Scaffold this active site. Structure first.
Site, PDB file in Angstrom:
ATOM      1  N   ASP A   1       1.221  -1.559  -0.092  1.00 29.57           N
ATOM      2  CA  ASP A   1       0.061   0.151  -0.115  1.00 29.57           C
ATOM      3  C   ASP A   1       0.783   1.107   0.198  1.00 29.57           C
ATOM      4  O   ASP A   1       0.466   2.078   0.584  1.00 29.57           O
ATOM      5  CB  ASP A   1      -1.274   0.209   1.149  1.00 29.57           C
TER       6      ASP A   1
ATOM      7  N   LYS B   1       2.204   2.413  -6.659  1.00 23.19           N
ATOM      8  CA  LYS B   1       1.503   1.433  -7.646  1.00 23.19           C
ATOM      9  C   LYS B   1       3.024   0.911  -8.096  1.00 23.19           C
ATOM     10  O   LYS B   1       2.642   0.017  -8.584  1.00 23.19           O
ATOM     11  CB  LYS B   1       0.572   2.325  -8.137  1.00 23.19           C
TER      12      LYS B   1
ATOM     13  N   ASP C   1      -3.622  -3.238  -1.695  1.00 22.25           N
ATOM     14  CA  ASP C   1      -4.121  -2.087  -2.434  1.00 22.25           C
ATOM     15  C   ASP C   1      -4.811  -1.320  -3.369  1.00 22.25           C
ATOM     16  O   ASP C   1      -3.160  -1.279  -4.204  1.00 22.25           O
ATOM     17  CB  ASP C   1      -4.458  -1.151  -1.121  1.00 22.25           C
ATOM     18  N   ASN C   2      -5.420  -0.712  -3.855  1.00 24.82           N
ATOM     19  CA  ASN C   2      -5.700  -0.018  -4.963  1.00 24.82           C
ATOM     20  C   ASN C   2      -5.264  -0.723  -6.040  1.00 24.82           C
ATOM     21  O   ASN C   2      -5.168   0.137  -7.357  1.00 24.82           O
ATOM     22  CB  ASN C   2      -4.875   1.267  -4.462  1.00 24.82           C
TER      23      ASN C   2
ATOM     24  N   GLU D   1     -11.438   4.668  -0.736  1.00 25.95           N
ATOM     25  CA  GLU D   1     -11.644   5.130   0.797  1.00 25.95           C
ATOM     26  C   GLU D   1     -12.606   6.101   0.970  1.00 25.95           C
ATOM     27  O   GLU D   1     -12.089   6.962   0.352  1.00 25.95           O
ATOM     28  CB  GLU D   1     -10.424   4.954   1.664  1.00 25.95           C
TER      29      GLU D   1
END
Ligand SMILES: Nc1ncnc2c1ncn2[C@@H]1O[C@H](CSCC[C@H](N)C(=O)O)[C@@H](O)[C@H]1O
Ligand SMILES: O=c1[nH]cnc2c(O)cc(-c3ccc(F)cc3)c(-c3ccc(F)cc3)c12
Ligand SMILES: [Cl-]
Ligand SMILES: [Mg+2]
EC number: 2.1.1.6
Length: 213
Positions: free
Chosen positions: A139, A142, A167-168, A197
């Site tokens: 997290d 990227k 995440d993401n 979020e």
């Protein structure tokens, strides 16, 4: 002051010392009502909680600490003696995170490391006495997900069953990492669709379970 300092002060003034759940709730309220911030949040955080409870990891590595939200979320569910290591490149955020964990009463469970993941990962075994990791939460940024996954493998830090949770993977998106783990026989992958979020925007987490070399 910065947004991150404002979030810390909000917790300190609106949560109960030593109560991790109240800390999470305060952060989520501030970030919903006052200023958005890139915490994993409650929607995706509930999926993380389910994963942590399934695996009861003894040693977790987090990449990207920020204000400590995810570190509080994971550390509050760890068993006695289990530990979280979290890597954070920004020293101001590292200091907020430490203070956040101290407020939550979780400082004995967490070691906040201040540096770049790509520099710290190769030091985990000798300097930080790690053998292998039970779980990794990705997290940070990227474009680091794929290179740091490969680095973890190179350094002998993954074992059969190590759980990577990323995440993401939808927003901003991690297409190289996703293509790689989903196409590699070294990983068993599951996608958990959710929401960015604090936003009505689709996002998701990927779980990639390492299967050995
Ligand atoms: N290479 C790197 N190594 C370590 N930390 C990094 C990094 N690149 C970015 N970061 C950090 O990764 C964080 C992303 S936000 C992390 C959010 C946190 N996991 C939570 O859910 O509460 C930022 O604080 C940023 O400074
Ligand atoms: O970088 C991130 N690290 C760890 N978690 C993040 C997260 O959960 C969300 C975001 C995010 C920010 C703004 C937005 F519109 C959508 C998503 C980011 C991020 C992405 C691109 C950026 F340019 C700067 C921040 C991060
Ligand atoms: Cl949320
Ligand atoms: Mg994130």
């Amino acid at each position: 002051d910065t947004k991150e300092q404002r979030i810390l002060r909000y917790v300190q003034q609106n949560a109960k010392p030593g109560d991790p759940q109240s800390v999470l709730e305060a952060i989520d309220t501030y970030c919903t009502q006052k200023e958005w911030a890139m915490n994993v949040g409650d929607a995706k955080g509930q999926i993380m909680d389910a994963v942590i409870r399934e695996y009861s990891p003894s040693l977790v590595l987090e990449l990207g600490a920020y204000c400590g939200y995810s570190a509080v979320r994971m550390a509050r569910l760890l068993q006695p003696g289990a530990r979280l290591l979290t890597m954070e490149i920004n020293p101001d955020c590292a200091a907020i995170t430490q203070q956040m964990l101290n407020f939550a009463g979780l400082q004995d469970k967490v070691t906040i490391l201040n540096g770049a993941s790509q520099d710290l990962i190769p030091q985990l075994k000798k300097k930080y006495d790690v053998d292998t990791l039970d779980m990794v939460f990705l997290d940070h940024w990227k474009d680091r997900y794929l290179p740091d996954t490969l680095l973890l493998e190179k350094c002998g830090l993954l074992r059969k069953g190590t759980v990577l949770l990323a995440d993401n993977v939808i927003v901003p998106g991690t297409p190289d990492f996703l293509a790689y783990v989903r196409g590699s026989s070294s990983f068993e992958c599951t996608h958990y669709s959710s929401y960015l979020e604090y936003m009505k925007v689709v996002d998701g987490l990927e779980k990639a379970i390492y299967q050995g070399p």
